[PDB]
Structure formats: structure tokens, C-alpha cells
Amino acid sequence: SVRLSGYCGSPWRVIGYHVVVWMMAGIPLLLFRWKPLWGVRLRLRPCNLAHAETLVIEIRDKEDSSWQLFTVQVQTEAIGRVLRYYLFQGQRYIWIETQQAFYQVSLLDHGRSCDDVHRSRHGLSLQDQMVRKAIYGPNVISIPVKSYPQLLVDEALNPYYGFQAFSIALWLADHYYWYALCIFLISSISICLSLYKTRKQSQTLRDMVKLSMRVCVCRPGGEEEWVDSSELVPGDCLVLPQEGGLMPCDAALVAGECMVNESSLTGESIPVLKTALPEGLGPYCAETHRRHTLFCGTLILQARAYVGPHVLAVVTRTGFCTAKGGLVSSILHPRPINFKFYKHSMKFVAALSVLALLGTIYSIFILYRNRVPLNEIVIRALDLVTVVVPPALPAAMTVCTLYAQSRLRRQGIFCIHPLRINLGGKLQLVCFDKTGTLTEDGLDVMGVVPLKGQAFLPLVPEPRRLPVGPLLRALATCHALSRLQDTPVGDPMDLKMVESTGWVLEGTQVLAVMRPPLWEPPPVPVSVLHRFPFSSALQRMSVVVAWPGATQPEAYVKGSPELVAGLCNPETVPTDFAQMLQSYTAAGYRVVALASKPLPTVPSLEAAQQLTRDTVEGDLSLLGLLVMRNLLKPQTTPVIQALRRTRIRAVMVTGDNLQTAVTVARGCGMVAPQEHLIIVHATHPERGQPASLEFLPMESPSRHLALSGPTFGIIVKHFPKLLPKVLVQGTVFARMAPEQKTELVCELQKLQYCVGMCGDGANDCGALKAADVGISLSQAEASVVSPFTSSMASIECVPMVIREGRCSLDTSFSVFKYMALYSLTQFISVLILYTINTNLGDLQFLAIDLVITTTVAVLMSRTGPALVLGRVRPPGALLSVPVLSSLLLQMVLVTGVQLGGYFLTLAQPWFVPLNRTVAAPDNLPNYENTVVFSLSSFQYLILAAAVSKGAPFRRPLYTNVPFLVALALLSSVLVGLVLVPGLLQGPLALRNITDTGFKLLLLGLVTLNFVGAFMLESVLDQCLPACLRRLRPKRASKKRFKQLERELAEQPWPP
Ligand SMILES: *[C@@H]1O[C@H](CO)[C@@H](O[C@@H]2O[C@H](CO)[C@@H](O)[C@H](O)[C@H]2NC(C)=O)[C@H](O)[C@H]1NC(C)=O
Ligand code: ALF
Ligand SMILES: [Mg+2]
């Protein structure tokens, strides 16, 4: 469905439109452009799609008519005859000139037979390498680092900077030099900080994503060590390293068997067995199988060659095509954040521009009636537009976030992009990674089962209180651990077993001698006679150990419990073992069984110790099983209760097994004991019969759903109508691919849920960016991508960022209301004086614009958040009846006092009219200016105090002593300026009033509007919500999640 079009034109015609916009640099274009689509369409000069410079790709969603616009450069490279390559949206769409046909990179895949990949077991000649290198590019994910001019274009395209630039120009023209400098300097640091930050993030991301490991391509002429790094081709063959190696390319292992860590892909640190691909005549690609294939970013722990000279693999995917590359494409190319407040603010700012256009005509006509010079009128008309639309408004709103960032830094939460703190306020759903976020990172031995008799025996709580004798020996001496300088080096689970007992590891053939904790309530310090490894096929490791009693040694074999049972004698094995194993597996307790064979072998003789691995392990008595699980965390259960009490929903997104997710979620309190959990499985249509949705309930002593990634895939394609019904009711998503984690967050946010991701990353990094609020719980990988990074290493960060957001959004509402009211009250004062051929004097404007607004705006935004989270949520809508009503009614009172005062001043007999001949600047001292300015000054202080709500989301206003002091000291200066004739009257161009009575009445008008404003705001705040229900009782929410929850209330999908 993509709309791809070719382009060419006359060089003079291209230079012509470069004279129109490129000389202008675009900043006028956007000043005359609502949106660029109309311009974009035919700005570029069209041609045959055969030959092009850039390509207009317009991608349409047919269903929603989603005609998204893109323009993409044409790559021309010579293999030996030039081939056309197009780098669309990251990925390579390759154009064959001969067939006039676009073909995307990875269209090679035709379901290439398992046998086809086997046929290409060895990489072809330098001619094949040469062309493949041209077809697929280098084996790298190329993150572009853009230039300061290119970054400056995108930042400075923002229309407000255009308006600020226009404003600063007019201010330098009208001689308002002091404030002009302040707005320019504030802008300069803001743009610079944005540019510096933008470059740094790309630089760090480019550094992090780049992998530089030298590899050995396998070719009969070409199979040599470290022959290349970035040259490895999608068809090429490679030798897997015999030890630890980080895989550069997604590949399939032709020969041998390997153990890999998939922590990048899944987030589970436990090693996974990969075996040599069976040669398959059937035309099947490995994509579906996903089983015998090692992915880019995975670590090969162990690589074992048995059938061949070395472990041998064939590449499948390279560069941007690999899954890692898919995630890099996911973290690049980001959709903008949809926030009702920010768009509604721009609509309100636009509405003020319509009032400015009206104001300009009133200014023009009345000044023309005043018969002022034409020159004056054009500067003054424009000046009013800058009075109406406040040029500092963005800078003011940032001050709220800047404070909240500082509080968060003290709490240990390091937040880049502080405007994202506001999004914290609106969060309705927090999505959680399981491993190293909600649960503890390493599996911990919970207990051991004795098997004393024929049947199994009860689990022992404390390994430190080891039962003294053979179990105590077995647990202490069951080590694969290598001795290190004041440390045991080895596998964490093996370390945990040794640690949990409390025994410490320090003859001719005596190896790694085992000793006690050095408290006696048996010390019996013991030597390991023989040691046999945990081969992945075998699933068993055997340690022969002899205690210092001149006794027969015992051989302890630790293995997978079924294999241990198979090896173990049937009299030793219990019938209940299967049920016990099943129960512990279902509980999420890792079951690893240790068996004992009494051995009639002379100790300290290598001949006696030496036997066949299978013969030693062949028949034994099961000594016990070992049970290990994640312990949730200390603070995990509390945080989830608070979120659930607040009515914020919690969705467990894990890359782990669904059975584990079910038990941890129940423990977490995501699913409470009363709450009923349904398991949803979708069977794919492999037989051609269409896909079947199956719903199975879970029994335990707000109905919600548990899903797997495969199921999610089948629902996202084969049940599109039902996906919404899943998403609004699904609380556990398990075995989810790192792409699927992003996709969950994408489909949640299209349902109008404001969504927050908390995770330790490398798998959820995509979700961390995608989510409106992204919290990293690790300083590596996650930290770089996440807007918010904790160092606390708990879920307890999530409530703090909600609280800080709720304060920040409520403060941001008040600061916008203040900045709106200040611009309008100045707009009234300027127009009121303009009617009489007068203006607010220079240095009077400076008093209001510089000293008053800055002081109240900086000091009103200090208020920290409310102590405890409440069910009520801060409003998201700035363009709404409650806020607009407050502004309209406040302005009526404000206009009232000013007009009343002016006419009262006219009414008094001492009053003398102004010159009206000489101009607004020329008539420096005048009663009308003095009374308007004197009344107006107090209103800016009054409005600031009135708009600060405080109590529900922030600490009480009285707690903000600095703000009250600031208002008190500023109020004193103003009250002094009216009451006493002062030197300052000369600089501020104010005429003293003889009648103290009139001045006391003028203060009277101030105290009327003070009491009035506070009462007017309070009464509206109290009654308007009640009035809303009276006016519209049946009023229903527009948010899609709210509607779907209602539908579900009427009739339940999977009942
Ligand atoms: C108001 O405007 C000015 C204030 O300085 C004064 O007007 C000037 O007065 C002188 C005589 O003192 C005349 O020669 C000028 O023609 C006046 N010019 C203008 C432009 O007004 C005076 O105080 C007031 N003007 C009038 C006309 O009374
Ligand atoms: F640690 Al996870 F999905 F549970 F990355
Ligand atoms: Mg994790």
C-alpha cells in the first residue's frame, strides 16, 4: 500500500525554491505554515521512479486512511554495473533496474529449506562475499550522530522561538532593552542545553550499541582465526568459540551442542541448551523454529564439538535485520508524546492570538482617531500582540519541572527531559518487568527434602541448620567451585548452596578441602576424592568425597530429579516423587536432586578414584532434593497494594514461563486471593482450520486474564476485534519477545491508557522509551534509553515519580493560569490607557514583566507534593469549563476594579485631564496612568496567590513561607509607593495624590478585589463539580479503556 514516487527538475528551478525557503532557512516558512503536508507534496520536482535523488514514500493504513509522509535518499554503488539501494525507515529496500522492482532486504527468505542452509555449510568465494557485502551492507547497526546546525534546525523550527524572535526584534525597536535581553538569554541557554543533551544521548546510544569482536569465517581457503569483525555475511559460515563468546550475527548451529545466556533476548540469566540443526528436506525456514539458532547479543557460555573437529554455524540475519537491530530500530524513529494538556495549552495560546488580532484593529482605529504618527501605530499595534500572547510562558512552565527534578535528584531518581515529570500525574497503568525489578535477581535455595524412608519427607527451612551427618557433608562438598583469592569463583547457585550451609572451603590427591562455620553446638573437615562435570546431555555432576574417619568414601551425584530418579534404585525412588516434583515446579521452586552411592574404594589412590562416568553414576540412593526460587523483594508487596488502593492498574510483562508469572503475581498482590485469574491460549491455524481462542481458569483457595507471547501474536493478527477486550482485562503477559513488550505498550496507549514502564532493561529498553514515563532500575543499557533512572533498585521509585508528577501537573495548571491572567490584566491596562492616548510608562512595564512576574512564578512553583497518594487524579484538560470559567469570572472582577477606579479618579474634583496632544511616552507623569498602574500592580500579586490550589496534590500554601514573604515584601513596596510621596515616583513616572481619603478608597478597591478573587475562585472550586452532575447526570467518558470496561461490565468476554 506504500506510495513511492520519482523526482527531478531544472537546477535553476531548485535554486529558485532555495532562494524562496533555503535563504529564509525555513523559519518564515513555518511562520506561514500551519502544517507542511501541502508544501511537502510538490515542493520537490517530480520524475520517473526509474531514476531518483530522494523518494516520497507515503505509507497508507487503508482502514483509517493513515497517509504518513516520508522522503528517502537513493544510494548508488558499483558491485563491479551500478545497483540502486533505498534505506527506507532504517531497513534496505533494494531496487533491481532490469525488472523495475523494489525488493526489501530479508526477501531472500522464501522458507529456504533446513537442507538449503545445510547445502550452504561452507562460505562461497570472495566474488560471492563481494556481491553479498554490497547487497546487505556491513554487519553493524549505524546510529546517525547529527550536526549542531541540523539539531538547531529541528529545535529552532518550534514556532514559540519564532514568536520570541519577533518579540525580541520589536522590543529592541521600541527601546524595551532590559527585558528583551532577559528573554533572549533565557532562550539561548534553553536551546543550547537541548542541543547539548540531544547530541550526548545519540553519542552514548551509538557507543553502547556498537560491538567489536573479531570472528573466524569458516571457508576451505578462508577458515582462519579472527579473519574479520564487521565483514560477516548473511550466507557465511563461522566457527563458534570453544569458551565464552558474544554472538555478532543471528545464526543456526550446523555441528555440535552449546549452552547460551539469553539475558539480552528474554531477561532470564539461566543457561539454555542449543543443539545442531537436524538436516530437513522439508521447505522450512528456522524463523518459526527459533530453537537451534543463536541470536546477536546472546553469550555462548559453553560450545562442545563431538560429531566434528569444531562447533560450526551458518549465519541467518546480519546488521539491522537481527532482533537486537529490530530493538535499535524500535529505540530510534520515535512517535511524539500525546499529552492533552500540552496540545490544549497550544489551542488556548492560539485563541489569545485571535483576541490580539481583534485588539490590533481597536488600537489602530482609536490611535488613528487620536491622530498619532503612522510609525508609532505599527510598533504599538504589534506591541499589544506580544502583551496578549506571553513570550515567557514556556520558560515559566519549565520552572515547575526544574524544582521537581531537584527533589527527585535528592530522592536518588536521576531524570533527564524534566517535562516528562508532568506525564507522571496522568499515569493510569504501570507495567512491570519481573526479574531484578519486582523479584530478587538471583534464585535463592528455600529448602531441602530428606527422603529418609521409601516415601518423600518434609522440607527443612534453614540450610545453616544442616542435619549433622551425610546431608551436612553432601551439601558442603557438592561444589563445582574453583578456589580464588579470599573468594569462591563459580556458578551463583553453587556458591548459594555453599554459603547457605555456612561451611568454608580451604593429602596426595586431596582437592578443595571443606571445613565448618567455626561454631560447634560436627566439624568433620572432609576431602573431595573425585569430581565429574554437569554435561548438558547427561544432566548430572558427580563428586566422590571421603571424611577423615578411615572410612569407605561416598559418591554424591547432583542432577535433574527425573534423571537422578532414573539412575536411582526403584526401592529408593518414591511413587509420590512425580507429584512432589510437579508441585515444586508449579510453585516455581527449582528442583535439583542429589543422590549418594557408598563406594568400597581405598582413599587417596587415583586408580581407586578413576572409573567410567556412566558406571560411577549408574545406580545410587536419592540423598535429597534442593529447592530454589526468587524471594519477590522486601518493599514489592507494599508498593503494589498502594497502586491498587489508588486504582492505578499493574500489568506484569515478563520474558519468563507463565507458571512462574502466575505465582509471583499472586504473591505480588496484582491478583488478590479473592480475585479470579483466567489463562488465555490461542492455537495458530497450521492445519488450515482457522485459529481457536481457548480460555482455561486457575483455582486458588475484578476478573482478569493471563497470556503468553505466542497467544498475544495470534490475538494481535487473528483476533483484532478481541485484542481491546484482552488489553483492558489482561494483568500478566509472559514469554513476551522484546519487540512484543514495546507492542503491548503501543496497543495499551492507543486505548488512551497513559502508561509507565519500570524495568532493569536490555530486554524492556524498547518499552522504557515507548512508555510515557520510563523508569530504569539498572545504570547499564536501561539507564541510557530511560527518561527516569533510579539508583534505589526497587519498585518504591514508582510512587515517588507519580507524587512528584501530580504536584508538577497541578503547579503547571496554576502557573499557566497566572501567566494567562497576567497577560490579559496587562492587555486590559494597555487598552484602557490607549483609549485616552496614554500608555504604561517604560520602567512601569519592567516592574510588572521583570520583577513581579519572575518573583511570583519562581516562588509559587517551590511547593513539594502531598504526603500520601489519593484516589482523585489531577485534571489533564487546560481547555475546559472549570479553568475557562475561573479565568473569565476573575477577569470580569479585574476589569471591574480598573474601570471603577479610573471613573472614580475622573469623578473627584482635584482631577485634571491629560494633554492628549503630545504622545503616550511624552506625557510621563499623569493621574490616569498613576491610578491604573497603582490598582493594576496589586492585581498581579492578588491573582498569583488566588490561583495556587495547594491541598489535594501539593503541601498547603501557608507551608510555602518564601512565597508569602515575597508577596508581603512586594505588597509593602506597592503600598508605600501609593501611601507616601517617594523618590521612586520619579523613576516609575507616578504623580502623588493630595487626598489621603481617595488613596485609602483606591486601597479599598484593592482589598475588595483581594477578598473578591479568593472568594470567586473558592466558590467556583467548591460548586462547579456538583453543578456539572446537575447539568449532565448521564455524561460518559470518551477514553476508549473506560468504554471497553463498561461493555465488559454489561457482558464479560471469556466468562
Ligand atoms: C500638553 O502638551 C504639552 C506638554 O509639554 C504642552 O503643549 C505645548 O505647549 C507649548 C506652550 O507651552 C506650545 O507652544 C506647543 O505648541 C505645545 N505642543 C503640543 C504638541 O502640545 C501643553 O502643556 C499641553 N498642550 C496644549 C496645547 O495645551
Ligand atoms: F526480567 Al524480565 F521480562 F522478567 F526482562
Ligand atoms: Mg529483568
UniProtKB/Swiss-Prot annotation:
Please state the protein's primary subcellular location.
membrane
Q: Which reaction is the catalytic activity of this chain?
A: spermidine(out) + ATP + H2O = spermidine(in) + ADP + phosphate + H(+); spermine(out) + ATP + H2O = spermine(in) + ADP + phosphate + H(+)
Looking at the keywords, is Calcium present? no
Pfam families in the record? E1-E2_ATPase, P5-ATPase
Chain segments annotated as coiled-coil in the UniProt record? none
Which residues carry out catalysis?
A: D433 (4-aspartylphosphate intermediate)
Positions in the Lumenal compartment = 174-176, 369-383, 834-839, 898-930, 984-999
**What Enzyme Commission number(s) appear in the record?**
7.6.2.-
| SUPFAM superfamilies the record matches | Calcium ATPase, transduction domain A (SSF81653), Calcium ATPase, transmembrane domain M (SSF81665), HAD-like (SSF56784), Metal cation-transporting ATPase, ATP-binding domain N (SSF81660)
Instruction: List every range the entry marks intramembrane.
Output: 12-32
Entry annotated with the keyword Protein biosynthesis:
no
Question: What InterPro entries does this protein's entry cite?
Answer: ATPase_P-typ_cyto_dom_N, ATPase_P-typ_P_site, ATPase_P-typ_TM_dom_sf, ATPase_P-typ_transduc_dom_A_sf, HAD-like_sf, HAD_sf, P-type_TPase_V, P5A-ATPase_N
Residues binding Mg(2+) are: D760, D764
Q: Which residues lie on this side of the membrane: Cytoplasmic?
A: 33-155, 197-347, 405-812, 861-876, 952-962, 1021-1055
> Per UniProt, what does mutating K949A do?
Reduced spermine-induced ATPase activity
Q: What is the effect of changing L941R?
A: In KRS; the mutant protein is retained in the endoplasmic reticulum
List locations, semicolon-separated. Answer: Lysosome membrane; Late endosome membrane; Endosome, Multivesicular body membrane; Cytoplasmic vesicle, Autophagosome membrane
Q: Which UniProt keywords apply?
A: ATP-binding, Cytoplasmic vesicle, Disease variant, Endosome, Glycoprotein, Hereditary spastic paraplegia, Lipid-binding, Lysosome, Magnesium, Membrane, Metal-binding, Neurodegeneration, Neuronal ceroid lipofuscinosis, Nucleotide-binding, Parkinsonism, Phosphoprotein, Translocase, Transmembrane, Transmembrane helix, Transport
Q: How is it modified after translation?
A: Autophosphorylated. Accumulates in an inactive autophosphorylated state and autophosphorylation is stimulated by phosphatidic acid and phosphatidylinositol 3,5-bisphosphate but not by Mn(2+) or Zn(2+). The presence of spermine results in a dose-dependent reduction in autophosphorylation.
Q: What is the effect of changing M736R?
A: In KRS; some patients manifest neuropathologic findings suggestive of neuronal ceroid lipofuscinosis
Which consequence is recorded for altering G442V?
In KRS; uncertain significance
Q: How does it assemble?
A: Interacts with MYCBP2; the interaction inhibits the ubiquitination of TSC2 by MYCBP2. Interacts with HDAC6; the interaction results in recruitment of HDAC6 to lysosomes to promote CTTN deacetylation.
**Disease involvement:** Kufor-Rakeb syndrome: A rare form of autosomal recessive juvenile or early-onset, levodopa-responsive parkinsonism. In addition to typical parkinsonian signs, clinical manifestations of Kufor-Rakeb syndrome include behavioral problems, facial tremor, pyramidal tract dysfunction, supranuclear gaze palsy, and dementia. Spastic paraplegia 78, autosomal recessive: A form of spastic paraplegia, a neurodegenerative disorder characterized by a slow, gradual, progressive weakness and spasticity of the lower limbs. Rate of progression and the severity of symptoms are quite variable. Initial symptoms may include difficulty with balance, weakness and stiffness in the legs, muscle spasms, and dragging the toes when walking. In some forms of the disorder, bladder symptoms (such as incontinence) may appear, or the weakness and stiffness may spread to other parts of the body.
Protein name listed in UniProt:
Polyamine-transporting ATPase 13A2
**What organism does this protein naturally occur in?**
Homo sapiens
